Design a protein around this motif. Sequence first.
Motif, short mmCIF file in Angstrom:
data_model
loop_
_atom_site.label_atom_id
_atom_site.label_comp_id
_atom_site.label_asym_id
_atom_site.label_seq_id
_atom_site.Cartn_x
_atom_site.Cartn_y
_atom_site.Cartn_z
N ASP A 145 0.83 -1.20 0.00
CA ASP A 145 0.00 0.00 0.00
C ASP A 145 0.86 1.25 0.00
O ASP A 145 0.68 2.15 -0.83
CB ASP A 145 -0.94 -0.01 1.21
N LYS A 146 1.81 1.34 0.94
CA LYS A 146 2.71 2.49 0.99
C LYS A 146 3.42 2.68 -0.34
O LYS A 146 3.47 3.80 -0.87
CB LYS A 146 3.73 2.30 2.11
N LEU A 147 4.00 1.61 -0.88
CA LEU A 147 4.70 1.69 -2.15
C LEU A 147 3.81 2.30 -3.22
O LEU A 147 4.07 3.40 -3.71
CB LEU A 147 5.17 0.30 -2.56
N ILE A 148 2.71 1.61 -3.54
CA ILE A 148 1.84 2.04 -4.63
C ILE A 148 1.36 3.46 -4.42
O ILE A 148 1.23 4.24 -5.37
CB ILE A 148 0.66 1.06 -4.79
N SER A 149 1.09 3.83 -3.16
CA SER A 149 0.47 5.13 -2.90
C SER A 149 1.47 6.28 -2.96
O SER A 149 1.09 7.39 -3.36
CB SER A 149 -0.22 5.10 -1.54
N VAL A 150 2.72 6.05 -2.58
CA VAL A 150 3.66 7.16 -2.41
C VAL A 150 4.91 6.97 -3.26
O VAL A 150 5.29 7.85 -4.03
CB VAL A 150 4.04 7.33 -0.93
N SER A 151 5.56 5.81 -3.12
CA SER A 151 6.91 5.65 -3.66
C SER A 151 6.93 5.84 -5.17
O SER A 151 7.63 6.71 -5.69
CB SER A 151 7.46 4.28 -3.28
N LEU A 152 6.15 5.02 -5.88
CA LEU A 152 6.11 5.14 -7.34
C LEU A 152 5.68 6.53 -7.79
O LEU A 152 6.37 7.13 -8.63
CB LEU A 152 5.20 4.06 -7.92
N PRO A 153 4.58 7.10 -7.29
CA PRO A 153 4.22 8.47 -7.70
C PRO A 153 5.22 9.52 -7.25
O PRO A 153 5.27 10.60 -7.85
CB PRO A 153 2.84 8.69 -7.06
N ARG A 154 6.01 9.25 -6.21
CA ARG A 154 6.96 10.25 -5.73
C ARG A 154 8.19 10.32 -6.62
O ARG A 154 8.86 11.37 -6.67
CB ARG A 154 7.37 9.94 -4.29
N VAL A 155 8.52 9.24 -7.32
CA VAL A 155 9.68 9.25 -8.20
C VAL A 155 9.48 10.31 -9.28
O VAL A 155 8.38 10.48 -9.81
CB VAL A 155 9.92 7.86 -8.81
N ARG A 156 10.56 11.03 -9.60
CA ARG A 156 10.44 12.16 -10.52
C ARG A 156 10.16 11.70 -11.94
O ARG A 156 9.24 12.19 -12.60
CB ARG A 156 11.72 13.00 -10.47
N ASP A 157 10.95 10.74 -12.44
CA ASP A 157 10.89 10.31 -13.83
C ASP A 157 10.31 8.90 -13.95
O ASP A 157 10.76 8.09 -14.76
CB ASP A 157 12.27 10.36 -14.47
#
Lengths: 176, 92, 77, 63
Positions: A100-112
């Motif tokens: 959940d944390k990954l999908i919600s924040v990590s991927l969308p937080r990456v710049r490119d």
Amino acid sequence: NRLKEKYNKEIAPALMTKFNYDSVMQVPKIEKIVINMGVGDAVQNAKAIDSAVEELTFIAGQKPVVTRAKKSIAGFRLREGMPIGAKVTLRGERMYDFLDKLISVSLPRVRDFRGVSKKSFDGRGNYTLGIKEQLIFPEIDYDKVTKVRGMDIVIVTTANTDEEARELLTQVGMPF
Amino acid sequence: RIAGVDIPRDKRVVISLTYIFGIGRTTAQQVLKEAGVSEDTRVRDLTEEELGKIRDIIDKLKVEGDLRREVSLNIKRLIEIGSYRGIRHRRG
Amino acid sequence: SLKKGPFVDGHLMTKIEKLNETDKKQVVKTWSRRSTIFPQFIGHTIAVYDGRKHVPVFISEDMVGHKLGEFAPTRTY
Amino acid sequence: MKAGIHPNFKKATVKCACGNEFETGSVKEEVRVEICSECHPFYTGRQKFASADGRVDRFNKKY
RNA sequence: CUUAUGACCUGGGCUACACACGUGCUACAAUGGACAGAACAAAGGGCAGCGAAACCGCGAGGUUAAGCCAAUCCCACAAAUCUGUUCUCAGUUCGGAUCGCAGUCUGCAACUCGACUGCGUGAAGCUGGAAUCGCUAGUAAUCGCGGAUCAGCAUGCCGCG
């Protein structure tokens, strides 16, 4: 929760009807998610082993293990029994919360971030994510972040084929 | 962060915004004028209003995320099309 | 040239027009390295005199933003 | 779960600048974020800005 | 030597550099960097030439055009400097080179091949080995100004303050 009900009510029935399985629990399941560090700089920085251990405890409460060299090597100035990297095994609510944390924040937080690699499958039904940034998601305390050594995530599933694992991941929300 | 990259907290907003590629002096000053922050403030001392203002301004305007790709595309084009200029580029 | 319009030699433009009015055909030789590439140059495998020989070059779409000298080197090494 | 070897897990409400709220068991009691899943353009389908700027060159024959 | 060691023309080269060395310019910063306000100049040029003023444009510059064959008019509002705001000892709000893009002066055309401007970055570089150079007064150091060659090209030259 926020993931268990979604899975059991959308992914399992839909995927079962799509693949025409002969039983209910024949649907592939995500067994565990293993996070490996693999820092090899400990030879030159004995304290580097401490790094990614205090960070992994914050990423997931499950304390990592100080994995040690099973074999010595001269090219890397290694000796059997010396610490290398770190290991974490998430099974249960921990892996769901991590997803959940990954999908919600990590991927969308990456710049490119755009079209994550499709060839990351191991050929059997398991997925691996190669992270090269140590501050991907908020629990890493950018201020306290000094090194940018990324992470290595291993997603393990009971899928017997790569196509069904791909379908499961896509329905879960993996933005391929 | 605003453009996905951290900025100095102990510096003025004008120069803190310059650390973002594509957003230099003129662009940063124009964004600050559009936001109405007076250009003399700390970035560690701000509120959600003027933070989201600059955030949406940047999202509407060009960003390093797009410039990094546009410049690379142009370089690869001018290198592939021949372009003795591009030949010099490849030569370094 | 900034607003006076693009640049091209009259003889080369006439040759290209004659060659394009019906169909693109054999190389169009010319010594006009000065000429700037236009969309009409597309498909025509123009030749450029590098000083001692003619180098035929196939002008694609993206070549409009360059000159023939950019594809006709002169120095040797 | 070992005793005291791990930090205390706490349910937190992951927030976003766009207003999207997500809940995940985290060490922090709360987690402020700027770009959530939907906020990131890739998750928004064909992003408007990208879909508009992604056109190929036309030689700039306007003038 | 001579139907070529002479002559006409397109293009190229004269401007290539793993290199080394003379001369000059810019830098490594707090006697400093950026922004606001203010003063003083000396010499020289102007007829297809010099071009006020107005408008447009952040900009280099473009349009209409006054005036001047000149102690008249213009080039042409010198900058250092001073009084303030601001930053703070860092490879930095130092330097702007290399660099991608977009433009300006000219000219048939700045692509081998000028300069200038804006955008975004920014290294080499934090004072530099033997040794070596110029300078005894308005000299040293240092800041600007004008002309030659010139359609368009100066860190060099000539002079001026």
